[PDB]
Design a protein around this ligand. Structure first.
Ligand code: SF4
Ligand code: SF4
Ligand code: FES
Ligand SMILES: [Zn+2]
Lengths: 92, 72, 101, 184, 15, 688
């Protein structure tokens, strides 16, 4: 149920993606499905999706007081990236 | 008022614009003239044929002399 | 050290000639001028105020890039826009509108 | 229309191993050669009993800041006996020790020193003594296309603080550069 | 100690 | 092995077949119906022209481009001559030389003789063409012909003594401009060009008229006699007033900018410039603030030092505001300043930062959702336009000219929704209601049929809708239109959203959207880089207002501390334009007084305020930029958005049934630069 209480201190989060392989395996499908459902369950959290030519697929989270936490997603699958997200939201 | 104020400094004798307004128009007879003064060289001001089909004087763009057509 | 910009000066927007296009040229983006208090002339203090576009005219972006890299100062090459060439027709000028609606 | 004779004879009898380009214009006849045989070629001339040059008129440098071989050394030299002059023009890069001719024509030490400081081209044998034209310890070589017209450090004025000093340039009324070009 | 960037910034804006 | 003039990417529409012609000997390949002039161009020889412009229609009118095409009679006009397979073109034969000599002889015969006062002397085609191709002696003594000069508003003064009857201005004003006022009237030698009822020209692109007209008769009034061309240097920059980000060249002398002129870019603005921008420099010189100022408690302003100013602002910032710190990003600002401001605020801990004209509502962030997808170039390939809530003639004048170019090329039905306005191309007016937008997302309003019976449609939503409360409903209705009309296919993504600022794209890109709505009301320490915050009024009585800006005219009388900065012609920033293309400007003239760049002042403020930024050089700033949004460091190439608009609506009831309000008015007093500037002020007073 953490997809609704992740907005405690997750103030921003952005997905850096590429328009080619090595990301489309997990990044694009996760982005589509989980973004629809998350923006539904999170009406106020800025979930950015930025894509340029030739970058490694990665997730970035901006926590309160301006702190950046990054995660590389080179060769992960959808379950792995979901666990990565659940681990990003849980900071404590 | 502003141009002569930018360059001239004395403001006791009249500025060039004031003198060239002090000279009256010429009141020529035809429809087209040419301004040099009285010589072709040694006085410059190349040929500047200027029309005269308006009820107001027409300047010359060198040494503005304001020619004017006489009759109707 | 100084950042320089390597570009090709585009065609002047007033004439219609072509003897000054496609000529790679490096500029030192130096702008530190001020007004000489006595008269009003424009003073400066940069030794490279004008040389980059007064004598240094290069034949191609490759040569200018190699030269900037050789003298060491870091560069950033710019892009060169070229006119697309369509097809025109005096008949297309005198085209024919359709029948009345 | 001047000296086709000497030039033709010189080209048709030369060891053709060391000639890279020949131009028989009417402005001036050019033997563009390789920098490795320059002394050999010049010593062929001044000695052969037909094309004996025996006098070197000029050694000038030309700068082309767009070619891999940046510099261009040029020897203008005439033949007072055969009423003819030729221009032997060699290429030269940044540091590349060029041969000397002060052994043949002793009238090259000053022209080779001048091409040492004005430009930066070296000279392996004797004539590369210290600078001549430019004053003293000088940053660059002030005739290539990089040394700006007004110099790097050129303000030079008296100081009652001590005596006199040289300080970086802060000139007034900067050098205006007009364009004047003409796209036809 | 003022992180010499600032030391320049207080002077002219051409560094 | 012969490169075309300037480089010119020929098209080869049908690359399987293409004719070949002999130009002055060696052969060249040419598409099907290309003209002799363009064939000679491809071969690499320029031909003298007066009355032929690559963007206007052809007219064999000046009679100077003559060449001889062997296998034909004696003279041939190069332009308007369709190339034939194998014709033997020749350009440098005694026939052509004498033709050019005679024609130049006639022109200079009945020309005036006032070069040393006629500006464009040093730039004039006629001048250079005569000097390079014409004779050297004139044989003529009799009296010439002279006509009276004319006024065309305070932008384009004309000394018509030298109107050589080219009809370039006429063809431009009737094809590209849209308004038919100029016209050639008279006969024989007595033939003038001038509106017959002494009217003015109430349209933009008149600066483009003065650039078109080769001989120096139509000339910019505010640049009357200030300089020749050989005197001043040109720096190639971009534009920030409009939203297209036009490519221009700032011609400046010393620390003063003299004029600006377009430069070719066949992707954004062909070779034109909207009338607003060409005259936007005079005030950039005229009004200005050039010293950090502090409000003395008598309500006055005193000039202080940077140390003291930064110290007091950082002190009060740390002092009071726990969670009520807001920052408004300027209308004309760069991604460097925006990211620096956002980082400074987030390190301060309290974050309500938002761009200039970006709405307080949700404003979701999908690049395909908030950029113009089809590049302006591709816009020349549409067939059915669906302009909603937009008057692109007043905002993004270059996009308006592109739409007009399309409608002129091939008649493309255009339907426009919103308030009444004066379009210059046969527009259909569909109504003023998002209710009508709903009906057309549904089955009524038979115009929808047109969409379904369309090839390559285009649906253009103006960025003015971002500020409206119910924006997700509008965008969802557009989504339904797209899904039902098949306008989002992978071959062609025709779903465009305009913009009406230069900083709006980069702001929405970095993510500057307000986390709340009553931010200005609840705030106590506002950091402004741009003006207008609603009528600069919503800010409460007690609130520390710091205006870190330039060219201060408005909201300054509300500011509490003042920090001068560098304008758009004195710095190097990155601006993104509506098709998502990220360009960068270049410095042209020295900073005024002792102002400093925006990201520099932000970093210095951070350091003196404690929490500092880990970057202190433009390289590291753009590295952070690569970390947050990469194309902004992938400058000078548009990176499309290959993701659909699968946003999640939150209104789900209706579209609030309120009419579309006007987004931008007076077209000149917007853009604080022009506003506190001036020639735009008298243009607003007269040309309306
Ligand atoms: S436009 Fe003016 S400067 Fe040029 S030739 Fe014609 S009259 Fe002379
Ligand atoms: S003055 Fe301008 S509009 Fe008139 S004929 Fe000449 S170039 Fe054409
Ligand atoms: S350009 Fe061909 S006739 Fe004027
Ligand atoms: Zn006169």
């Amino acid at each position: 149920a953490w997809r609704g209480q992740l907005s405690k201190n997750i103030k921003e989060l952005r997905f850096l993606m590429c328009q080619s392989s090595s990301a489309s395996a997990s990044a694009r499908a996760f982005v589509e499905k989980n973004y629809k459902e998350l923006k539904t369950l999170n009406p106020k959290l800025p979930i950015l999706i930025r894509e340029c030519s030739g970058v490694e697929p990665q997730l970035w989270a901006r926590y309160d007081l301006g702190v950046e936490k990054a995660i590389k997603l080179e060769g992960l699958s959808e379950a792995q990236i979901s666990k990565a997200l659940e681990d990003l939201a849980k900071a404590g | 008022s502003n141009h002569t104020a930018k360059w001239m400094q004395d403001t006791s004798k009249k500025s060039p614009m004031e003198l060239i307004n002090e000279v009256p128009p010429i009141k020529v007879e035809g429809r087209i003239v040419a301004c040099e003064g009285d010589t072709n060289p040694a006085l410059g001001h190349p040929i500047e044929f200027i029309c005269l089909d308006l009820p107001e004087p027409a300047v010359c763009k060198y040494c503005g002399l304001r020619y004017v057509q006489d009759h109707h | 050290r100084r950042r320089v910009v390597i570009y090709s000066p585009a065609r002047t927007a007033s004439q219609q000639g072509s003897g000054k296009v496609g000529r790679w040229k490096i500029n030192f983006l130096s702008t530190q001028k001020w007004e000489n208090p006595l008269m009003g002339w424009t003073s400066t203090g940069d030794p490279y105020a004008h040389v980059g576009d007064s004598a240094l005219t290069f034949d191609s972006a490759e040569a200018a890039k190699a030269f900037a890299e050789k003298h060491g100062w870091e560069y950033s090459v710019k892009k060169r826009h070229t006119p697309l060439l369509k097809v025109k027709s005096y008949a297309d000028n005198f085209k024919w509108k359709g029948f009345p609606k | 229309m001047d000296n086709q004779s000497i030039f033709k004879y010189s080209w048709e009898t030369l060891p053709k191993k060391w000639v890279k380009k020949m131009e028989r214009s009417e402005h001036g006849n050019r033997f563009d050669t390789k920098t490795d045989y320059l002394f050999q070629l010049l010593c062929f001339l001044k000695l052969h009993t037909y094309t004996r040059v025996q006098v070197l008129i000029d050694i000038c440098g030309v700068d082309y800041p767009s070619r891999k071989r940046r510099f261009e050394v040029v020897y203008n030299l005439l033949s007072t006996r055969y009423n003819s002059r030729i221009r032997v023009q060699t290429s030269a890069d940044e540091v590349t020790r060029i041969s000397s001719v002060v052994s043949l024509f002793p009238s090259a030490g000053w022209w080779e020193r001048e091409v040492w400081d004005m430009f930066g081209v070296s000279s392996i044998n004797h004539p590369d003594l210290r600078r001549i034209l430019t004053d003293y310890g000088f940053e660059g070589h002030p005739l290539r296309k990089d040394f700006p017209l007004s110099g790097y450090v050129e303000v030079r004025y008296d100081d009652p603080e001590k005596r006199v000093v040289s300080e970086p340039i802060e000139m007034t009324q900067e050098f205006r550069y007009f364009d004047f070009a003409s796209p036809w | 100690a003022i992180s010499p960037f600032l030391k320049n910034f207080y002077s002219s804006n051409y560094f | 092995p012969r490169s075309p003039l300037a480089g010119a990417r020929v098209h080869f529409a049908n690359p399987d077949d293409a004719i070949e012609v002999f130009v002055d000997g060696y052969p060249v390949k040419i598409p099907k119906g290309m003209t002799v002039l363009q064939a000679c161009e491809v071969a690499g020889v320029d031909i003298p022209r007066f009355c032929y412009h690559s963007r206007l229609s052809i007219a064999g009118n000046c009679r100077m481009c003559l060449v001889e095409v062997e296998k034909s009679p004696k003279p041939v006009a190069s332009c308007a001559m369709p190339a034939l397979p194998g014709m033997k073109i020749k350009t440098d034969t005694p026939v052509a030389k004498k033709a050019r000599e005679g024609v130049m002889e006639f022109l200079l015969m009945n020309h005036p003789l006032d070069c040393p006062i006629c500006d464009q002397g040093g730039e004039c085609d006629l001048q250079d063409q005569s000097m390079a191709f014409g004779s050297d002696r004139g044989r003529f003594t009799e009296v010439k012909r002279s006509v009276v000069d004319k006024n065309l508003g305070p932008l384009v003064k004309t000394v018509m003594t030298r109107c050589i009857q080219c009809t370039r201005c006429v063809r431009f004003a009737t094809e590209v401009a849209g308004v038919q006022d100029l016209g050639m009237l008279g006969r024989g030698s007595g033939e003038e060009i001038g509106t017959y009822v002494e009217k003015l020209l109430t349209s933009e692109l008149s600066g483009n008229v003065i650039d078109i007209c080769p001989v120096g008769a139509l000339t910019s009034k505010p640049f009357a006699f200030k300089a020749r061309n050989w005197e001043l240097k040109g720096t190639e920059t971009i534009d920030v007033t409009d939203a297209v980000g036009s490519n221009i060249r700032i011609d400046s002398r010393g620390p003063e900018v003299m004029r600006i002129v377009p430069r070719l870019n066949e992707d954004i603005n062909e070779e034109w410039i909207s009338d607003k921008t060409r005259f936007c420099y005079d005030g950039l010189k005229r009004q200005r603030l050039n010293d950090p100022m502090i409000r003395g408690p008598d309500g006055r302003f005193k000039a202080v030092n940077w140390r003291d100013a930064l110290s007091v602002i950082a002190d009060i910032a740390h002092q009071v505001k726990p969670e009520e710190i807001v920052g408004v990003a300027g209308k004309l600002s760069d991604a460097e300043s925006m990211i620096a401001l956002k980082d400074f605020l987030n390190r301060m801990g309290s974050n309500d930062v938002w761009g200039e004209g970006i709405g307080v509502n949700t404003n979701a962030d999908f690049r395909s959702g908030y950029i113009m997808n089809t590049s302006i170039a591709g816009l020349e390939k549409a067939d059915v336009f669906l302009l909603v809530g937009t008057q692109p003639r007043v905002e993004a004048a270059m996009v308006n000219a592109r739409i007009r170019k399309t409608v002129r090329s091939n008649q493309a039905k255009v339907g426009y929704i919103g308030p009444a306005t004066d379009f210059n191309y046969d527009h259909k007016h569909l109504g003023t209601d998002p209710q009508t937008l709903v009906e057309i997302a549904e089955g009524r309003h038979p115009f929808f049929k047109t969409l379904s019976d369309a090839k390559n449609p285009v649906i253009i939503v103006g960025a003015g809708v971002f500020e409206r409360k119910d924006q997700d409903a509008i965008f969802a209705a557009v989504e339904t239109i797209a899904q039902k009309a098949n306008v989002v296919r992978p071959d062609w993504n025709g779903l465009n959203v305009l913009l009406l600022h230069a900083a709006q794209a980069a702001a929405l890109d970095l993510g500057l959207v307000p986390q709340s709505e009553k931010s200005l009301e609840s705030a106590k320490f506002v950091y402004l880089m741009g003006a207008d915050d609603v009528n600069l009024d919503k800010i409460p009585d007690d609130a520390f207002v710091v205006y870190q800006g330039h060219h201060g005219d408005k909201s300054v009388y509300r500011a509490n501390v003042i920090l001068p900065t560098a304008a758009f012609s004195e710095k190097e920033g990155t601006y993104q334009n509506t098709e998502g293309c990220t360009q960068q400007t270049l410095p042209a003239v020295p900073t005024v007084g002792d102002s400093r760049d925006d990201w520099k002042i932000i970093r210095a403020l951070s350091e003196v305020a404690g929490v500092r930024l880990p970057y202190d050089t433009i390289g590291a700033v753009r590295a952070r930029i690569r970390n947050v949004a990469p194309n902004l460091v992938n400058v000078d190439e548009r990176e499309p958005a290959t993701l659909p608009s699968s946003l999640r609506p939150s209104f789900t009831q209706k579209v609030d049934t309120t009419p579309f309000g006007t987004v931008i008015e007076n077209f000149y007093m917007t853009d604080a630069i022009t506003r506190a500037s001036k020639i735009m002020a008298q243009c607003s007073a007269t040309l309306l």
